[PDB]
Write a protein that binds this ligand. Sequence first.
Ligand SMILES: [Co+2]
Ligand SMILES: [Co+2]
Length: 263
Amino acid sequence: AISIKTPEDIEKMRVAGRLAAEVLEMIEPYVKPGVSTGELDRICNDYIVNEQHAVSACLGYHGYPKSVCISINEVVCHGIPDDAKLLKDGDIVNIDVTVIKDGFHGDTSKMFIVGKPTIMGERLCRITQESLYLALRMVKPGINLREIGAAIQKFVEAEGFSVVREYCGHGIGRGFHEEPQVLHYDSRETNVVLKPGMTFTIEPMVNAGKKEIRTMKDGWTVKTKDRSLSAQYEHTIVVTDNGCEILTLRKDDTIPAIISHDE
Ligand SMILES: [Co+2]
Ligand SMILES: [Co+2]
């Protein structure tokens, strides 16, 4: 069931979008060498809850134990903040945040580099981000959701990299994961012509090598099959009459918040 958000809904989202972005803006300083994914997890929850007056949708979601996800290096997804995993150097972590305020979610994620980059590190990240912005621009009404995934795909492989098919982006709003499914790859299955008011996520997961993954014992931690690196960046967006509106834009984003295709 694809939901077309009301204007008000939209105002709500803008809010969740921002709070969510804020948590990532807030944590920036704390992300340094010698940190516990666990602690990081504490600081966020306090913030989301204390200061923010909001809740985290990750918590208990399908039994998820933590408040947010934190995926180090070759961990792909759902990495679980342990009070004992500490931050190296050349560590490239993703923190995926997802927050609920007034019924609506704001879902976003980004990569952080630790205590002096790797090269391969910085490359991937950089590329992952571009592949995301890249889709960001395509977003406009009347476009098939399908040329978007292909696009990311093209870009990414072209760097000798691989796109992950197991996971994908999703509609979002009052429901954490709504319709549709947003695939970061080409597929005949795909066939959605976008409309204003539809809201959803772009969350490309990019491995430096091969598109194959493994799931751990703990039932969450997803790592590369290869043990290659993997990056992801994500944003929550709304389709406008002429392009899109990023509801999770942060200060460090090098893309406008409003993307218009008119004139
Ligand atoms: Co997310
Ligand atoms: Co998401």
